[PDB]
């Protein structure tokens, strides 16, 4: 009889997607990435700074 938005209604969100509980519990919306130490090449830097 009435349409309820899952983005606002938590019960409807859980009804439509059981994985939302796991997503919220594991905080997958703010997951940290693994740090890498890759450096750009000298040719790339020279091309970027070239006029």
């Amino acid at each position: 009889v009435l349409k309820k938005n899952p983005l606002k209604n938590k019960q409807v969100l859980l009804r439509l997607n059981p994985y939302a509980k796991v997503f919220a519990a594991e905080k997958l919306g703010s997951k940290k990435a693994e740090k890498t130490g890759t450096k750009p090449a000298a040719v790339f830097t020279e091309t970027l700074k070239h006029d």
């Binding site: 349409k3 899952p6 439509l16 997607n17 890498t36 450096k39 790339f44």
Partner: protein
Amino acid sequence: IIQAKRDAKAAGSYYVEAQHKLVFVVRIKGINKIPPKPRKVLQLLRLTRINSGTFVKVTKATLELLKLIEPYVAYGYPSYSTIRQLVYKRGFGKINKQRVPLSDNAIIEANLGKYGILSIDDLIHEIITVGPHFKQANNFLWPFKLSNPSGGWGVPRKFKHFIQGGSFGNREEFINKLVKSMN
């Protein structure tokens, strides 16, 4: 994709990402004084009223349609969050020629279960990755009836190209902000 660009830069090369396979198109002009061929293309893309939106698979056959209806639509490349919010809030299914809201996974399982789609998340997956049943899933989705943007269009005059300070044409990644404002 992030690491592929970093490795290419470290190796002195350039990583070119694959071209977009999906666009989202919203009709921005009304139904008065439309030339016949663009009117026919709008009807073929199911944009029969202002602030109506649809997903289009990007091929050579559809890029020419988008080129034909360029002065009357705003289209771009939707993100996963934009697609998810559109399907969650304004997602409706065409069942027996009726517009039915997608309030349960049983509806989607009953109508698109023969294509392996069992839930709204499966429908979103089939939309975001243009799969073998993209045509059936997209035609099952009723054309999205968006509102006017909540913060305005951001320009004084809408009917110029987005490049020239207007609103129509391909705005690429800014369709996400526009559609989230209109949703």
